[PDB]
Amino acid sequence: QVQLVQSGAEVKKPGASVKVSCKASGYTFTGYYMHWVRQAPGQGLEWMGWINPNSGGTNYAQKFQGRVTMTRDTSISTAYMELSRLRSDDTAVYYCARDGSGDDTSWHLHPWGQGTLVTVSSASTKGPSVFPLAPSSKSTSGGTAALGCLVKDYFPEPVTVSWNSGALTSGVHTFPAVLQSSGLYSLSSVVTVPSSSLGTQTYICNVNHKPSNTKVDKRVEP
Amino acid sequence: QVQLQQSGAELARPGASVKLPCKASGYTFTNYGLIWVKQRSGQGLEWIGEIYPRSGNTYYNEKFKGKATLTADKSSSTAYMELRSLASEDSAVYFCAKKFMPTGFFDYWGQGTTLTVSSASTKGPSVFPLAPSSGGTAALGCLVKDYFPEPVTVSWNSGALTSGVHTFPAVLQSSGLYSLSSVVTVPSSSLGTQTYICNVNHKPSNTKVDKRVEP
Amino acid sequence: DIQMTQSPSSLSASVGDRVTITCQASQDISNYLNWYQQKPGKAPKLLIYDASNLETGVPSRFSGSGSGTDFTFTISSLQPEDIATYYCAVLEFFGPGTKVDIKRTVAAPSVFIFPPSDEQLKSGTASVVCLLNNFYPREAKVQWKVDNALQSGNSQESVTEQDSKDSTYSLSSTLTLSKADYEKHKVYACEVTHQGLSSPVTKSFNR
Amino acid sequence: DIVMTQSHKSMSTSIGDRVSITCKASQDVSIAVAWYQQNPGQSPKLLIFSASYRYTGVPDRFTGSGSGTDFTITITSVQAEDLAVYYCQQHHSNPLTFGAGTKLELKRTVAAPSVFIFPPSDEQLKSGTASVVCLLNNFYPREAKVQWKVDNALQSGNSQESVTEQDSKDSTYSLSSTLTLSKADYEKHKVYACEVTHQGLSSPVTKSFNRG
Ligand SMILES: [Cl-]
Ligand SMILES: [Cl-]
Ligand SMILES: [Cl-]
Ligand SMILES: [Cl-]
Ligand SMILES: [K+]
Ligand SMILES: [K+]
Ligand SMILES: [K+]
Ligand SMILES: [K+]
Ligand SMILES: [K+]
């Protein structure tokens, strides 16, 4: 398929710089303008600029002019966006997006990269401690019980939670993280299951916090 | 089946105007820029300008500002180039071409339309022999002179003579008329015993002439 | 340079409804308006370009019209998965977004409670979790009872976005306690009041 | 404008051998370069784009390289179909520009032209014009000069010239020059000569005829 895969989430101290990557596959990278659009958490979309991967020309929003740099490596079909002198209001999800339109004035931004969360902060990266959430044991013999994983004390966002390596998708709820007074995040991934499978089937959650390269395949059992 | 269908050769008088069509099919006419390219005497590629049908915007080569005018008709999927105030130096082949990808280059081209600007009307040729000189190999030929427009077809002995034949490209005289040569080398022994007739046909004037070349 | 506005800011409609939202441009932009859809947690998706052209691969219930300054985007039959924020855009300028929610029948929460894990007690913290699963409407109250004593100031909540399949909400409350405080008591309970419940529901554990 | 310079209007090569055509840009164009092939009477065909990528349908014999200003298209194992003209094109900025073209041609052993002069036809003279034709037959390379002389006096601006394409079998070339005079001017002079200069000729050759 036509897709754009971006580098992982990162934390950067104020005043530092960040470089986000974007690898294009399924189409001739050199043939289409590449755009970057960021989104501060909860807010809207803000356009930063574009690059012509063929000629190497660029065009930046005047808001970012003297502070952003866009480049590309055609030998590996990768685009890059570097933002310097980072401040707290630069914390945002940074998106890759190709302009699939051949008109001189239309922009048809399709497809979009998955996004890179860049967190601007002086705090250090910390992996999560993953704890189990065991069924109440009471339950209803002919019903459904709940079990989950507690992903606690990590920084920066995000963590990704899977269950049984993606085999278990129904009834899964990974809640939004919550910021504790300590500056660390915490969330919960739960799943509802039939009370019969509690004694037979084994459920293991698959937490992954890439900013610290932490991976915990925790098994949940009463 | 991406195609760019252009019109056939066009003739026009100095000072006049022409509007050359480029009918596009097989792709989304609006998602690709179209350009026009001039080429005189099979020689160089000169960029005239580009039009984007969806936007309607146009970008011209400075040298063709005021001479060329590009338009695009989304309904017929046809691009048009209008050449104004025609002169001799506008005689050329004009190509149509479609952009490969948004960042440039051109993957599909029209076949080209040959435009001629001249103050002359159809005129058949006069074919004069070029007789061999006074063993070895001898040279003879025919001179096809003062005709218009192009082209002319020259064969020798109704096609039975091809080895050694050389039909040269036509030249444009100051009179606005074309002049061409066709020659063939043959063994000197053949002169006298073998007869040599150049067969000239000028379809634009329904002129069919056969000329016997003799020593 | 170009100011984009959208209306309504938010809306709640029912499965099957014909929903239309609007976008206005500070100046005439012919039919150059595009609409992008963005589901919570995902990247925007192009759905409509040049005001009315449906992007390949997008369902046919999405449409668009308008030229000049005023435009509309329409969902002929709202589907449960159509919950999202919809942004209009022209060139570099994005509209503020319209959020579409779904109104649904009431659904009572499946309440669950989890005591702290033994591993976490080694660390000196006690996290008691309480789960309210797939309910509607979104409003819900959670009161913690540490030992028949109504707790406060030591609970953090988190709610999920409307489910793409059944349009429900799930909530997760966490009571965080000093392990020194967690051992001195034994009757820990999570009380849940929701419209879908005839009476408040309480799930407890011991130890 | 950005000038795309193909320094060689023509290049000599041989079947099976390796040839590289050059293009230099007057300004940095990154990799925004394409290469087109064109045969007589046909439209340009795209072969290489973005400097080194092959257009769909192009055999591996065609490779492209360069970034910045110096660009090259290389044909390994030249075939007959490849004997054509090649244009570079930048798409860095407007105005879009092409190179002048380099025609691939076959090399072969030098061959001097066989010269022939032809007097005006009596049938033509009966009409008021007089055309004297000189012919350089089957020569290589195709660089050749023809000087017309009337009564040992050089002529200039009074003749037109025309050359054929490289012969399929001989790999040679032919040229036809026509000196056009009036019946009055032709009947007033005596000797008419065609002087031919060619690499394969030690000294310029002359073919003449006395009017009569
Ligand atoms: Cl550049
Ligand atoms: Cl700050
Ligand atoms: Cl998309
Ligand atoms: Cl969910
Ligand atoms: K670059
Ligand atoms: K575009
Ligand atoms: K506009
Ligand atoms: K206890
Ligand atoms: K060579």
User: Could you please report the per-residue DSSP string of C141-175?
Assistant: EEEEESSSSB--SSEEEEEPPPPTTT--EEEEEEE
Residue type, D142: R
Q: Do A152 and C120 touch (CB under 8 A)?
A: yes
The residue of chain D nearest to residue B173, with distances taken between CA atoms, is D160
Q: If we measure between CA atoms, which residue out of D75, D78, D99 comes closest to residue D88?
A: D99
Q: Are residues B100 and B157 in the same domain?
A: no
A210 φ/ψ sector (left φ>0, alpha ψ -120 to 50, else beta) = alpha
Q: Are residues D126 and D94 in the same domain?
A: no
Last residue of a domain, one of A58, A92, A120: A120
For residue A53, list chain B residues with Cβ-Cβ distance below 8 A: 103
User: Distance (Å, rounded) from C-alpha D32 to C-alpha D69?
Assistant: 10
Q: What is the C-alpha end-to-end distance of chain D, expressed in Å?
A: 58
Resolution of the structure in the document, Å:
2.6
Cis peptide before A158, with omega less than 30 degrees from 0?
yes
The residues with which D129 forms a beta bridge, in sequence order, are D182
Q: Tell me the two tokens of residue C164.
A: 């793409």
Residue B35 is given by DSSP the state E
Q: If we measure between CA atoms, which residue out of A58, A3, B105, A84 comes closest to residue C45?
A: A3
User: Distance (Å, rounded) from C-alpha A49 to C-alpha A61?
Assistant: 6
Give the neighbor-by-neighbor strand order of the sheet with C125-135. Answer: C110-114, C125-135, C169-178, C155-159
How many residue pairs from chains A and C have C-beta atoms closer than 8 A?
A: 113
Q: Are residues D9 and D102 in the same domain?
A: yes
CB < 8 Å & 24+ apart, contacts of C63-68: C64/C33, C64/C35, C66/C23, C66/C31, C66/C33, C67/C30, C67/C31, C68/C28, C68/C29, C68/C30
A165 three-state secondary structure:
helix
Best mutation target among A94, A106, A187 (most C Cβ atoms within 10 Å) is A106
> Which range of residues forms the domain containing residue A161?
129-220
User: Distance (Å, rounded) from C-alpha D34 to C-alpha D4?
Assistant: 11
Closest CB from A28, A55, A74 relative to D91? A55
A165 φ/ψ sector (left φ>0, alpha ψ -120 to 50, else beta) = left
Q: Beta-strand (E) ranges in chain A?
A: 3-6, 10-12, 18-25, 34-39, 46-51, 58-60, 68-73, 78-83, 92-99, 109-112, 116-120, 129-133, 144-154, 160-163, 172-174, 178-179, 185-194, 203-209, 214-220
- How many Cβ atoms are within 10 Å of C39's Cβ, its own excluded? 15
Subunits touching A (CB < 8 Å, at least 3 pairs)? B, C, D
D157 φ/ψ sector (left φ>0, alpha ψ -120 to 50, else beta) = left
User: Distance (Å, rounded) from C-alpha C79 to C-alpha A52?
Assistant: 38
Q: Are residues A143 and A104 in the same domain?
A: no
Q: Tell me the two tokens of residue C196.
A: 């879908």
Q: Are residues D101 and D128 in the same domain?
A: no
Sign of the Cα pseudo-torsion (A27, A30, A35, A36, in order): positive
Q: Are residues C64 and C29 in the same domain?
A: yes
The residue of chain B nearest to residue D41, with distances taken between CA atoms, is B42
Q: Are residues B101 and B12 in the same domain?
A: yes
Measured in angstroms, how far is the CA atom of residue B56 from the centroid of ligand 4?
46
Residue C184 is given by DSSP the state T
Interface of C with A in 118-137 (CB under 8 A): 119-120, 123, 127, 129, 131, 133
Instruction: Indicate the number of domains in chain B.
Output: 2
Number of residues assigned to chain C: 207
Q: Are residues C82 and C124 in the same domain?
A: no
Q: Are residues B106 and B135 in the same domain?
A: no
The widest CA-to-CA distance across chain A, in whole angstroms, is: 67
Domain of C53, CATH number, reads 2.60.40.10
Number of residues assigned to chain A: 222
Measured in angstroms, how far is the CA atom of residue C59 from the centroid of ligand 4?
22
A interface residues, D as partner, C-beta within 8 Å: 28, 30-31, 52, 54-57, 74
Q: Are residues D81 and D160 in the same domain?
A: no
Measured in angstroms, how far is the CA atom of residue A120 from the centroid of ligand 2?
9
Q: Are residues A141 and A102 in the same domain?
A: no
Residue type, B56: G
Q: Tell me the two tokens of residue B103.
A: 């960042």
B32 three-state secondary structure:
coil
Residue D167 is given by DSSP the state P
Q: Are residues B108 and B187 in the same domain?
A: no
Q: Do B166 and D160 touch (CB under 8 A)?
A: no
Q: Are residues B16 and B75 in the same domain?
A: yes
Q: Are residues B67 and B171 in the same domain?
A: no
Q: Are residues A20 and A62 in the same domain?
A: yes
Q: Do B139 and D133 touch (CB under 8 A)?
A: no
Closest CB from A54, A105, A106 relative to B103? A54
Q: Do A54 and B99 touch (CB under 8 A)?
A: no
Best mutation target among D50, D69, D71, D97 (most A Cβ atoms within 10 Å) is D50
Q: Are residues A23 and A107 in the same domain?
A: yes
Q: Are residues C12 and C89 in the same domain?
A: yes
Last residue of a domain, one of C102, C124, C159: C102
- How many Cβ atoms are within 10 Å of C70's Cβ, its own excluded? 12
Measured in angstroms, how far is the CA atom of residue A24 from the centroid of ligand 7?
28
Last residue of a domain, one of B97, B117, B137: B117
Instruction: Indicate the number of domains in chain D.
Output: 2
Q: Are residues B76 and B142 in the same domain?
A: no
For residue D29, list chain A residues with Cβ-Cβ distance below 8 A: 55
User: Distance (Å, rounded) from C-alpha C83 to C-alpha C12?
Assistant: 10
CA-based nearest distance B73→chain D, Å = 23
DSSP run (H or E) holding A200: helix A197-200
For residue D50, list chain A residues with Cβ-Cβ distance below 8 A: 30-31, 54, 74
The residues with which B113 forms a beta bridge, in sequence order, are B94
CA-based nearest distance B117→chain D, Å = 19
Domain of A155, CATH number, reads 2.60.40.10
Closest CB from D32, D49, D53 relative to A55? D32
Q: Are residues C37 and C95 in the same domain?
A: yes
- For chain B, say whether D32 makes contact (Cβ under 8 Å): yes
Please name the residues in contact with A150: beta carbons below 8 A apart, sequence gap of 6 or more: A130, A131, A132, A133, A186, A188, C117, C120, C127, C129
Please name the residues in contact with C180: beta carbons below 8 A apart, sequence gap of 6 or more: none
Q: Do A131 and C119 touch (CB under 8 A)?
A: yes
Last residue of a domain, one of D77, D106, D135: D106
Q: Are residues B9 and B111 in the same domain?
A: yes
Q: How was this structure determined?
A: X-ray
Cβ proximity of D154 and D103 under 8 Å = no
> Which range of residues forms the domain containing residue D9?
4-106
The residues with which B165 forms a beta bridge, in sequence order, are B184
DSSP letters, D119-156, are PPPHHHHTTTEEEEEEEEEEEBSS-EEEEEEETTEE--
- For chain B, say whether D5 makes contact (Cβ under 8 Å): no
Last residue of a domain, one of B75, B98, B117: B117
- For chain A, say whether D32 makes contact (Cβ under 8 Å): yes
Last residue of a domain, one of C48, C75, C102: C102
Q: Do B101 and A33 touch (CB under 8 A)?
A: no
